[PDB]
């Protein structure tokens, strides 16, 4: 019924109100077919990261200090907290949104095949006289 | 290790106010409900007040509904109790305990040493000591305030056969009695003496028992 | 309010015995029950939490069980360090309520008291007052009754008697009855007796003093 | 349409920014107060007497295991309108560390959720509370890990 | 004897689909009634109101492995009001020769609009217990 | 409300088993017969239960706890699982483990619903706030 | 009864009876006429019905608990659920009415066999005096 960027009014099926912008929440629906929609900025510690007609804001997610994470970008009213890892580290994802920060492998007793990436560990090839076991160069003695 | 310490107890007049302190060390003070538990002399245990972790919730006994006020300073690891409009009933020894919570249960785990609080309008008064194979003699002690009173016999020369009785109260005044059991072959050849002492009035008396 | 009926008030026993203390709850309190021991002159220690669980660092000879509103504490093999007063505590509702208490006492053979009666002091009679003192020392069990007789008539006004805790060497109790009267009422009568009934003798021990002699 | 429900329900979630404490919120997305229930002084206020399902969850997180064995608790209670009588309904305790984390090995992270709920008879004007002992171990990282709610029967 | 019109749903897991948690409703004691649908392994809300939302999973394993194992169970919402996956209820469990069992039941009361999509998900389907019926389910109840 | 509803708790007197007791709501047709709930009329029902196991130390043998709500239907005269769960509490300190069950089911008249466990000797039957079994017609 | 043996009562008509469905089939639609066939159809792959029924759905096939050391005796067919069991020289310990675990049969080494190992019962062993059976296996003190 209502086009993109507009939602259907709850109490009356006819009216199409303009959706609130990111960073704001729905304080009141629009009164008429072509009138403005009362939208107010999300309060402290909350956010909305997309166009919405949501009467409350989402709670700012936090960085898992136990996963060795660090805050890339803080929480703004229009964007949730973005967390990541440090330098010379990569991400191992235990779930869709759960990841841990491990130090990048240095390929001791070996050479760096593929450099360390954001979500993949360093690829190692071992020197002469070393076998490769789970990306580590163990001896044969 | 873990230790709680009470401070600030003392003799107070009726209608007065007093502040008790509980010093906590050896555990995370912010991770325990805290509670005060009093017991009167020669009496049983009586719950007084409890307080939650952040101190936002307070729970008092009906006897002290509007008079007492428990407070909590987590940063200082200290528990306080404001005893206003004191009554004679509030005379008791006061403890501060940890109120822990397990699976559908609670308990008082760690107990403090305890502080003593007394409520009596009477003024300080020193005592008045008045004086078969075995011969049992004894000297009384009447009209003293406040406690304690240390009664000794023959300067500790005779320990066995001595029964220093617990005190009793009558009209804002204490009264105790002591007894000494010595063989008849010793007295009056010994002229045994009882040594009363009142360190609250700085008085001390030596009295030998002499027959009438 | 919830009331905790604790029984027995006093309990004599000996080491290596089996002893059971019970508490009865006015209402349902669930597992929100705890036991405590208080030795003389010291602060109370936690014995059992969650109605039936041994507290941290408690000797294994303790146990506890539960019925609907009845809660019992059991000491398997009694030891000397286990003598004192025990309390039961409920923690479901405000006000949190303690039990009346249970005194654990070292058993002993019976002992009759040594009664000592004393007329007032000379220095006392000068201060306008006079107190008669009657001692009852080194007896067992602790239950005893004392009656004063002023010229044969039982006097029940003016008595201030205090008992003592059982001794450390012989485990015997002692009681001291004091009868203070005015000097004008102390010299009006002549004979004052001290009657003491006990489970040791069917005849109450009588000791008196007459102002005639 | 369909008849709406008059059943007193509530669902409040933890405030992530208010560290050092467990503070419930309802003015966030997917938090709820409906048909009488209110959130006053960090407590759920019961509007009508009856049987209620209380449910809560607090997600505890840590890294490694210290020498001192840590005990995590979670407790729900009520406070009656008259005489401010406190009644204890639910409580739990968990020791997440069986032994100290050995040095030299990576102090791995652990996650211990504590579920706590049940059916209880509540009175009008009751103030329901949900308190933990050590907020140092809370998990505010994402939404939906610490919540508190009641549903009338 | 008038039938109820409350939009309810109760879907069970597919034991025949190892390696994933696929919700089925064409089974005995599984339910879709009064408007609720199952599209893209998600439950769709047919009318606005108050809903109970619940999901139980049962994790199992034969002994504790050497490498750490982390279990997750998350109920999510994608609303017409906010067309982004948002966590409603979430749990993270670290369970570590003898078998172990870890059930996770997640329930709550939520306000829902028409067109919302709900999903119950996990991170390790190699730990689900498909042995018997009644161990893994997912559902909503209208009030 | 004329909707049939039941909420039964454990029987503290009948120790050694999990015997449901309706008096200590069971109104508007739902009967308790042979420890089972009998559906009085067809329609949608919400079936819920919670049991609370507890112990005192972990023994030598392994411990497994099961809680299962089963259904004997007129359409299918065989005990069939609706809601089931398993716990392993032991891998000197007392342990406590609840188990929660709940879901919506279309039932018919005469169906019998049971709620059973496998270890009554570990059941904290006295905690009626966490040992219950109930249904509500939607 | 309101309906004869082998039949059920129609939901619409309180005076018309329909024939129950057979093992391996579910109820698609009740019988139209008082003497006409009921629309019963075979259960689909992964489901079954092991009894006479007028159920409108098929039950999910069980699976064997590989964590219980179980193995599949018979597969799941339309009229019989999955049947699981243990291997040879193994017995079943039922933790619950339906949950059992497989254990290797005791060997009674240095002991007397009072009864052989059975399907749901382990070997009965008594050891010589001095040697004890901690795990139902004889070992010296
Ligand atoms: O505390 C926590 C954290 C995680 C789980 N948890 C918890 C705690 C206690 C019980 C429980 O589940 C058992 C249970 N006891 C009930 C007692 C009463 C009712 C009920 C609900 C509506 C109604 O109209 N009448 C009765 C439902 C109950 N349930 C199942 C259940 C729980 C939560 C949300 C929904 C739900 O039902 C489902 F939608 F079908 C779970
Ligand atoms: C790898 O080489 C290092 C020298 O950098 C040596 O100390 C070490 O012993 C070698 N690896 C092993 C497994 O011994």
JSON list of N, CA and C in Angstrom, two decimals, chain G residues 81-108:
[
{"chain": "G", "resi": 81, "resn": "UNK", "atom": "N", "xyz": [9.08, -47.39, 14.01]},
{"chain": "G", "resi": 81, "resn": "UNK", "atom": "CA", "xyz": [10.11, -46.42, 14.33]},
{"chain": "G", "resi": 81, "resn": "UNK", "atom": "C", "xyz": [11.49, -47.07, 14.25]},
{"chain": "G", "resi": 82, "resn": "UNK", "atom": "N", "xyz": [12.52, -46.22, 14.31]},
{"chain": "G", "resi": 82, "resn": "UNK", "atom": "CA", "xyz": [13.89, -46.72, 14.38]},
{"chain": "G", "resi": 82, "resn": "UNK", "atom": "C", "xyz": [14.07, -47.55, 15.65]},
{"chain": "G", "resi": 83, "resn": "UNK", "atom": "N", "xyz": [14.69, -48.71, 15.51]},
{"chain": "G", "resi": 83, "resn": "UNK", "atom": "CA", "xyz": [15.00, -49.59, 16.64]},
{"chain": "G", "resi": 83, "resn": "UNK", "atom": "C", "xyz": [16.51, -49.59, 16.82]},
{"chain": "G", "resi": 84, "resn": "UNK", "atom": "N", "xyz": [16.96, -49.24, 18.02]},
{"chain": "G", "resi": 84, "resn": "UNK", "atom": "CA", "xyz": [18.37, -49.13, 18.34]},
{"chain": "G", "resi": 84, "resn": "UNK", "atom": "C", "xyz": [18.76, -50.14, 19.41]},
{"chain": "G", "resi": 85, "resn": "UNK", "atom": "N", "xyz": [20.05, -50.43, 19.47]},
{"chain": "G", "resi": 85, "resn": "UNK", "atom": "CA", "xyz": [20.57, -51.39, 20.42]},
{"chain": "G", "resi": 85, "resn": "UNK", "atom": "C", "xyz": [22.07, -51.25, 20.57]},
{"chain": "G", "resi": 86, "resn": "UNK", "atom": "N", "xyz": [22.67, -52.24, 21.23]},
{"chain": "G", "resi": 86, "resn": "UNK", "atom": "CA", "xyz": [24.10, -52.27, 21.50]},
{"chain": "G", "resi": 86, "resn": "UNK", "atom": "C", "xyz": [24.77, -53.35, 20.65]},
{"chain": "G", "resi": 87, "resn": "UNK", "atom": "N", "xyz": [26.10, -53.40, 20.73]},
{"chain": "G", "resi": 87, "resn": "UNK", "atom": "CA", "xyz": [26.88, -54.39, 20.00]},
{"chain": "G", "resi": 87, "resn": "UNK", "atom": "C", "xyz": [26.94, -55.70, 20.78]},
{"chain": "G", "resi": 88, "resn": "UNK", "atom": "N", "xyz": [27.69, -56.66, 20.24]},
{"chain": "G", "resi": 88, "resn": "UNK", "atom": "CA", "xyz": [27.91, -57.92, 20.93]},
{"chain": "G", "resi": 88, "resn": "UNK", "atom": "C", "xyz": [28.86, -57.71, 22.11]},
{"chain": "G", "resi": 89, "resn": "UNK", "atom": "N", "xyz": [28.69, -58.55, 23.13]},
{"chain": "G", "resi": 89, "resn": "UNK", "atom": "CA", "xyz": [29.42, -58.42, 24.40]},
{"chain": "G", "resi": 89, "resn": "UNK", "atom": "C", "xyz": [29.16, -57.07, 25.06]},
{"chain": "G", "resi": 90, "resn": "UNK", "atom": "N", "xyz": [27.94, -56.55, 24.89]},
{"chain": "G", "resi": 90, "resn": "UNK", "atom": "CA", "xyz": [27.53, -55.30, 25.51]},
{"chain": "G", "resi": 90, "resn": "UNK", "atom": "C", "xyz": [26.12, -55.44, 26.07]},
{"chain": "G", "resi": 91, "resn": "UNK", "atom": "N", "xyz": [25.82, -54.65, 27.09]},
{"chain": "G", "resi": 91, "resn": "UNK", "atom": "CA", "xyz": [24.50, -54.68, 27.72]},
{"chain": "G", "resi": 91, "resn": "UNK", "atom": "C", "xyz": [23.96, -53.26, 27.85]},
{"chain": "G", "resi": 92, "resn": "UNK", "atom": "N", "xyz": [22.66, -53.16, 28.11]},
{"chain": "G", "resi": 92, "resn": "UNK", "atom": "CA", "xyz": [21.96, -51.89, 28.20]},
{"chain": "G", "resi": 92, "resn": "UNK", "atom": "C", "xyz": [21.74, -51.51, 29.65]},
{"chain": "G", "resi": 93, "resn": "UNK", "atom": "N", "xyz": [22.09, -50.27, 30.00]},
{"chain": "G", "resi": 93, "resn": "UNK", "atom": "CA", "xyz": [21.75, -49.69, 31.29]},
{"chain": "G", "resi": 93, "resn": "UNK", "atom": "C", "xyz": [20.77, -48.56, 31.05]},
{"chain": "G", "resi": 94, "resn": "UNK", "atom": "N", "xyz": [19.51, -48.78, 31.42]},
{"chain": "G", "resi": 94, "resn": "UNK", "atom": "CA", "xyz": [18.45, -47.80, 31.18]},
{"chain": "G", "resi": 94, "resn": "UNK", "atom": "C", "xyz": [18.51, -46.72, 32.24]},
{"chain": "G", "resi": 95, "resn": "UNK", "atom": "N", "xyz": [19.01, -45.54, 31.86]},
{"chain": "G", "resi": 95, "resn": "UNK", "atom": "CA", "xyz": [18.96, -44.38, 32.75]},
{"chain": "G", "resi": 95, "resn": "UNK", "atom": "C", "xyz": [17.54, -43.89, 32.93]},
{"chain": "G", "resi": 96, "resn": "UNK", "atom": "N", "xyz": [16.68, -44.15, 31.95]},
{"chain": "G", "resi": 96, "resn": "UNK", "atom": "CA", "xyz": [15.28, -43.74, 31.97]},
{"chain": "G", "resi": 96, "resn": "UNK", "atom": "C", "xyz": [14.47, -44.83, 31.28]},
{"chain": "G", "resi": 97, "resn": "UNK", "atom": "N", "xyz": [13.15, -44.62, 31.24]},
{"chain": "G", "resi": 97, "resn": "UNK", "atom": "CA", "xyz": [12.26, -45.59, 30.61]},
{"chain": "G", "resi": 97, "resn": "UNK", "atom": "C", "xyz": [12.60, -45.81, 29.14]},
{"chain": "G", "resi": 98, "resn": "UNK", "atom": "N", "xyz": [13.18, -44.80, 28.48]},
{"chain": "G", "resi": 98, "resn": "UNK", "atom": "CA", "xyz": [13.55, -44.89, 27.07]},
{"chain": "G", "resi": 98, "resn": "UNK", "atom": "C", "xyz": [15.01, -44.59, 26.79]},
{"chain": "G", "resi": 99, "resn": "UNK", "atom": "N", "xyz": [15.77, -44.11, 27.76]},
{"chain": "G", "resi": 99, "resn": "UNK", "atom": "CA", "xyz": [17.16, -43.70, 27.57]},
{"chain": "G", "resi": 99, "resn": "UNK", "atom": "C", "xyz": [18.08, -44.76, 28.18]},
{"chain": "G", "resi": 100, "resn": "UNK", "atom": "N", "xyz": [18.79, -45.49, 27.32]},
{"chain": "G", "resi": 100, "resn": "UNK", "atom": "CA", "xyz": [19.73, -46.50, 27.76]},
{"chain": "G", "resi": 100, "resn": "UNK", "atom": "C", "xyz": [21.12, -46.24, 27.18]},
{"chain": "G", "resi": 101, "resn": "UNK", "atom": "N", "xyz": [22.13, -46.75, 27.88]},
{"chain": "G", "resi": 101, "resn": "UNK", "atom": "CA", "xyz": [23.52, -46.63, 27.48]},
{"chain": "G", "resi": 101, "resn": "UNK", "atom": "C", "xyz": [24.14, -48.01, 27.34]},
{"chain": "G", "resi": 102, "resn": "UNK", "atom": "N", "xyz": [25.07, -48.14, 26.41]},
{"chain": "G", "resi": 102, "resn": "UNK", "atom": "CA", "xyz": [25.77, -49.40, 26.16]},
{"chain": "G", "resi": 102, "resn": "UNK", "atom": "C", "xyz": [27.08, -49.44, 26.93]},
{"chain": "G", "resi": 103, "resn": "UNK", "atom": "N", "xyz": [27.34, -50.57, 27.57]},
{"chain": "G", "resi": 103, "resn": "UNK", "atom": "CA", "xyz": [28.60, -50.83, 28.26]},
{"chain": "G", "resi": 103, "resn": "UNK", "atom": "C", "xyz": [29.12, -52.20, 27.84]},
{"chain": "G", "resi": 104, "resn": "UNK", "atom": "N", "xyz": [30.45, -52.32, 27.73]},
{"chain": "G", "resi": 104, "resn": "UNK", "atom": "CA", "xyz": [31.05, -53.61, 27.45]},
{"chain": "G", "resi": 104, "resn": "UNK", "atom": "C", "xyz": [30.76, -54.59, 28.58]},
{"chain": "G", "resi": 105, "resn": "UNK", "atom": "N", "xyz": [30.40, -55.83, 28.22]},
{"chain": "G", "resi": 105, "resn": "UNK", "atom": "CA", "xyz": [30.14, -56.86, 29.21]},
{"chain": "G", "resi": 105, "resn": "UNK", "atom": "C", "xyz": [31.39, -57.14, 30.04]},
{"chain": "G", "resi": 106, "resn": "UNK", "atom": "N", "xyz": [31.20, -57.30, 31.35]},
{"chain": "G", "resi": 106, "resn": "UNK", "atom": "CA", "xyz": [32.31, -57.64, 32.22]},
{"chain": "G", "resi": 106, "resn": "UNK", "atom": "C", "xyz": [32.85, -59.03, 31.90]},
{"chain": "G", "resi": 107, "resn": "UNK", "atom": "N", "xyz": [34.17, -59.19, 32.04]},
{"chain": "G", "resi": 107, "resn": "UNK", "atom": "CA", "xyz": [34.84, -60.42, 31.67]},
{"chain": "G", "resi": 107, "resn": "UNK", "atom": "C", "xyz": [35.05, -61.39, 32.82]},
{"chain": "G", "resi": 108, "resn": "UNK", "atom": "N", "xyz": [34.92, -60.93, 34.07]},
{"chain": "G", "resi": 108, "resn": "UNK", "atom": "CA", "xyz": [35.07, -61.79, 35.25]},
{"chain": "G", "resi": 108, "resn": "UNK", "atom": "C", "xyz": [36.45, -62.42, 35.34]}
]
